[PDB]
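Regression test attached.
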Amino acid sequence: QTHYRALGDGWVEITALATRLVHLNMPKSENYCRIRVHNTTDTSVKGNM
Amino acid sequence: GVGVSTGSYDNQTHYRALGDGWVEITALATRLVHLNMPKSENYCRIRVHNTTDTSVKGNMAKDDAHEQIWTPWSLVDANAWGVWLQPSDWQYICNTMSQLNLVSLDQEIFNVVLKTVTEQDLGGQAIKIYNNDLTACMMVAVDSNNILPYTPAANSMETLGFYPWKPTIASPYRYYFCVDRDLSVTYENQEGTVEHNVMGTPKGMNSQFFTIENTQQITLLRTGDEFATGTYYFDTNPVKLTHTWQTNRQLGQPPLLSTFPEADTDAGTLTAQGSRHGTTQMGVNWVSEAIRTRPAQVGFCQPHNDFEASRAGPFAAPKVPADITQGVDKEANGSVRYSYGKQHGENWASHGPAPERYTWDETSFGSGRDTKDGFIQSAPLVVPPPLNGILTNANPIGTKNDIHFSNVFNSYGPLTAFSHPSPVYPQGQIWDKELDLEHKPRLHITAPFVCKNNAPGQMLVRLGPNLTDQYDPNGATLSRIVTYGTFFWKGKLTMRAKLRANTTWNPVYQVSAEDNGNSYMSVTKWLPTATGNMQSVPLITRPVARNTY
Amino acid sequence: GVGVSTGSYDNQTHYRALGDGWVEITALATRLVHLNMPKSENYCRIRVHNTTDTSVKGNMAKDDAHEQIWTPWSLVDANAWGVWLQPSDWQYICNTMSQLNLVSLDQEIFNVVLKTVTEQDLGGQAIKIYNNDLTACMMVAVDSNNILPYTPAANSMETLGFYPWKPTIASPYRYYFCVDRDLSVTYENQEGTVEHNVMGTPKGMNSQFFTIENTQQITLLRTGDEFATGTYYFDTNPVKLTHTWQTNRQLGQPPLLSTFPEADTDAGTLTAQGSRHGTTQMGVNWVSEAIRTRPAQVGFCQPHNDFEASRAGPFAAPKVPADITQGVDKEANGSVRYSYGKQHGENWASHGPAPERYTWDETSFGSGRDTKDGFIQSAPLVVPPPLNGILTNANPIGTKNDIHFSNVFNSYGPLTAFSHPSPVYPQGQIWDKELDLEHKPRLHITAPFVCKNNAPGQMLVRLGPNLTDQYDPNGATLSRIVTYGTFFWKGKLTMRAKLRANTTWNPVYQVSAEDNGNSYMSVTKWLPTATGNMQSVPLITRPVARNTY
Amino acid sequence: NTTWNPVYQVSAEDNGNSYMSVTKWLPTATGNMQSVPLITRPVARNTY
Amino acid sequence: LSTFPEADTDAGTLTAQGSRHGTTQMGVNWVSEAIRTRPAQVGFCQPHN
Amino acid sequence: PERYTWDETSFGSGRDTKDGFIQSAPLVVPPPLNGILTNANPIGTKNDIHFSNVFNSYGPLTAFSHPSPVYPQGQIWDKELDLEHKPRLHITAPFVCK
Amino acid sequence: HFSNVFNSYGPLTAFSHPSPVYPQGQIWDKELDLEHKPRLHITAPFVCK
Amino acid sequence: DFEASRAGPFAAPKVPADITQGVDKEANGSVRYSYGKQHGENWASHGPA
């Protein structure tokens, strides 16, 4: 629920609440990996900076 | 003294949020009222009898024959919504608040000025000179006990002006005398003559001639004097700033769907009617949405344009305002037709003498009645009914084929629950006085805030008589030096409102001001033109929908 | 009462030395303001569209098409330096003090007089008679919360008069309406047509029509009443009454001289560049005064006469005022061109309708930019550069040979440290209101004292409406007895200054008044002529130089 | 509220080709919700 | 405004530019709405892409 | 995906690029052909690039408005960049945590 | 070229303070006596306030 | 950029930043120090440079 509370000389205290069901799947690998992205198919074409 | 001022111009509206979601609106209104001298210094019993209308056969609705006592006093009547609030204030209140209630009313008269006119030649063509009368006064009486008849000037569209920067005038006070009027009902070019078009003599039993001198406490005000009538505390009921949509076929639990739609286009079929649970009041062995038992009727049917007649002439019986349906007809549900002037909202660029009119369609969408699609079946329900088993809005009642059963059908009953009609912006009426009868109405369609205990005392002003040196009291001459006056009126209307609560997922309706175009809410209506011609068209009072049940 | 006065004329300036070298200047200003009745009693949205200028191709700078809401209220606007101080006071403050700061502002309205005019023949040719209205009032509202738009009358040269012995007038109040204006850029007698010269309708999103009746607390003032708005305490930053001279080639330690001059005529050679110590940012193996590393840039380059356009039409972007260099051009550094009238400093013997104009050349000699002598070399420094390795103020940008690189080059950066522009005497502007945006400007070029918290509330006066006996509110006639009024305005501006310190050996620059001649500071300008024709030309604000770094 | 005229407001319009029709913020027959952005600053204010 | 409009359609002409009071930063002997001196720039130009 | 261009509602800070122009240093209106630079003249030699593509006029007297928060697919807060001279604003979030 | 004239200092520009230089550096500096100071001095990292 | 305001042409100071893979040092304002034997020059340098 969101709760509006008018407190003082024209000041409202909005109290936003958010509850979700997060679905945590297992990781792809258990290692910290330094992956490199290099799209040569785009940047090899002249004019694609 | 004559050279010092006795008040302050104030026109601001002050919102004050106090407590758990309650705002205290403090509307202020100051005008410059222009009091002219009365037409005569006598109380006169004038009679209106339009024989040119009612002599024509078929004009019983065009009757306005009556008698009125015309007093020399003028009315400072301020119960209209446009006096106190600007259109931005009304838009913010109707969008942001959920209900409105009246609290109190202070009123004041200050900065009195009386001036007499004289003539000079200066070119051979005489001009007026407006001198100053430092000793002439004006008479003020507040009818706080309501001895005099309650005549609201919002009935005649004659209240204070709605634009604060323009000087306004005071409406003349007059009330109704009780004489008998009889008019014979006849239609258009009917063979025969009008039997009754008479009006009676004053009756000895019920004749009330009130004077304002014998009934009130009159304060004289010179140029240095002020008047202030104190805080009248209202005892009204709150009106709701949210509108309803649920009809009698949208109350309770919906029937559970047997099948569900696969795509976003098709519908979902319910349980078949012959094998469906629920309750009805008909004797058939099936339940349907039309004949399911509801808690209460939301809107009632009311007779269209019934002209009753009881010792005063034919008058149309008032209808409770409800929504106009998909069947667009506005007369059946009683949409009020306002006719106002340049002081109260007409565009000032209208050179014609015709007023500005507006039909107020009500936003109570569950109480509206569709007259062409209403029907009555026989006492045992056998659908599809035969020809002689159903009465629709095509069959003639009596012998008249222009009149159907919806014109005479009243279905107000014990389980009828309708909504209070919305306040109308600027050319509305704020409060009313409860009728002095033992069994009161449930509502007034002229005002949303009917005062339970006492109406606020209506203010009566006039100019004191300025006499010449020649004055014979037994001679009907009354030379009477031509005077007039201007004074300042300041009033404070306190209101209490509650803030709106947001429960729905979707964005709800709001009154937003649109761009310049053919739309109803273009900004160029609420902005002055090149010559400063302002205009006030009404605003929606109830934008946000609410749940009935 | 009507026969007693309610204030005192006061115009003196009181210097009070308090503390360790701090003077409390107490400037006082009293004028007789002449309030005439408004042209109309309506708020009107007037539109200006000079098609005779903008229809000619090449006249985008001559555009002044807009819309304004014209209020019936007049503005008592006092923020100009000539209102409070005489020229001797300004000369003493600018010579003797080192900085100036604003403290507080009291304002007052007293000795109200309202008079109505009438006609008499007396010779067959009618003359006016100015009677007295002891009961008519005038309306005063101070916008201390700044609801209304901030329109300084120092923009239109319409503030109070600068000569205390002459009666002055109040400027009419009006503000800007937000409509869209589009103008197509084209040069002189270009083949083709002007594609865009349109102006739009009012927009529903951003339209603000303010009335002064619904927003303010209006005090009515008769002949015996006074008004006094209390001490507004300023929260500004001090301006400095000393000027700077150090450019970017005069910051830090000078290079030590290898040889010294024998006589008083010859110069002293420094250490040779290839074998000189120091730091640079170029890659060359020598240090010089041009390429030596400085702490910060003192003046920045700014684009000359850039006409931007965003939903209102072409407007020139404002420049920070800096010194005009040995390269005398005044447009590049933004020397403000003032155009004022006889009430504000024009010689009264000028029978022509043309105003008195004056270019204010700034005295910030280190921040000035020389545009003909500016140049850009290639990224590795190789001096002397070839033709294709240098961009000077002769090369065409784009294809236009009338436009060079200095017209588009902006070099405002993080290490840019410029000086605040000096206040301008009499026809200046003292304070301003900070723009209601999240990221404010660092300075305002219209006023040296931008109020941090709230601007002082602008004072709005008008005459109360005097009506004849004939007044129809639904008829647009408004007969309106011809009245006017005069009142007295007294204000007190408190300032705090610091005394100057003398560190230099040589006599420093001072603003002295010279004898009668062709000089700019002859005394005969500040003295009345045989018929009493005074004149106020501006004075130098910052005579005494100071050290930047 | 200082201005005389009615100021701009974000109102939800009827089913049509408008940007603020209610049928975007209502689920369909199979429950397919949708969130398009809303205007953050409807009400104009005075800069200077 | 030097002149005011009579009807609701026409505009109102201001004081002529060569004989108008005010302040500018250009060297011309006339004041106009385009070249009038303002307190601050509201929007800045920024390099496209 | 679903795409949407967020047009800002700061109507005083907007720049009209076709109607922007630069005149020469002494103002002589109507200017000649070589005395005005409009949004039609080629900068460098490129006729697809005009002077508005390179013109930056951010200065000391520049006062713009903070960009509005975007509903649902906005971003509420951000982290201030760990540099000595911070930006005046973040265009990704209206509430930069101090 | 265009890089010789292009200034892109703007409101959303966040750069780093220049590092002190060993031995032949400069420790402190004096702030310039102007109303609108620079954000930094490139001669010294510690500008005395 | 060699600006000029009442004292002669002076180069405008740049904020020092990194020289990129595009090795040019003049664009980002790399400071060029020139010092002597008292401040860090090798004392075996017989030249006056």
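Expected vs. actual: identical. Chain E has no helices and one strand.
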